[PDB]
Amino acid sequence: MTEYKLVVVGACGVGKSALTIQLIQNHFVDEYDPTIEDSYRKQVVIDGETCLLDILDTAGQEEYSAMRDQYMRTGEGFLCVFAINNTKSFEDIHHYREQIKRVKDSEDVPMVLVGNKSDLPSRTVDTKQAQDLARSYGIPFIETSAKTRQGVDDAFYTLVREIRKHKEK
Ligand SMILES: Nc1nc2c(ncn2[C@@H]2O[C@H](COP(=O)(O)OP(=O)(O)O)[C@@H](O)[C@H]2O)c(=O)[nH]1
Ligand SMILES: CC1(C)CCCc2sc(N)c(C#N)c21
Ligand SMILES: [Mg+2]
Secondary structure, rough: OOEEEEEEEEEEOOOOHHHHHHHHOOOOOOOOOOOOOEEEEEEEOOOOOEEEEEEEEOOOOOOOHHHHHHHHHHHOOEEEEEEEHHHHHHHHHHHHHHHHHHHOOOOOOEEEEEEEEOOOOOOOOOOOHHHHHHHHHOOEEEEEOOOOOOOOOHHHHOOOOOOOEOOOO
């Protein structure tokens, strides 16, 4: 069966770890270590195909060494996460996209924009502005809540579909 290498990126505290644990283990984790970077495997069924997901949950200070660049190049798809109550994390999206485009040496990288913490009453990033941004990038936009599990499967599943469309080219 096919293996899909997914990388979860985004600013500090947007919910990278919460979304990953939620997908892999079907439970919400409130206090996951903000500095631990790790990978997780899960056999899933997307559409009709049984496939294995290998998800790298990124953390820690950014490092632009040849090694870390070669390591990120390995990723087939990128989950670009911001929190809908953090404007700065939404503006940090550009920079993640540019680093992904650079290491992949392509303008066509499977990618999904994720607006996390949709359950929160505080919202500083409107849905239409994030939708407009993903439209200029030509990528899907999925709103999520790692707390309520809203859109979690949709976010990772859409990314796999994005890798599938890329491979068949
Ligand atoms: N209300 C709410 N809090 C969330 C959500 N996802 C994560 N959090 C909280 O946001 C904080 C940072 O989340 P975390 O997974 O560590 O993010 P990371 O630094 O991006 O890996 C923690 O207090 C989480 O419990 C969500 O969807 N809703
Ligand atoms: C994790 C992230 C910031 C996002 C994905 C593209 C690249 S390439 C590189 N050396 C990185 C680091 N550190 C990254
Ligand atoms: Mg984390």
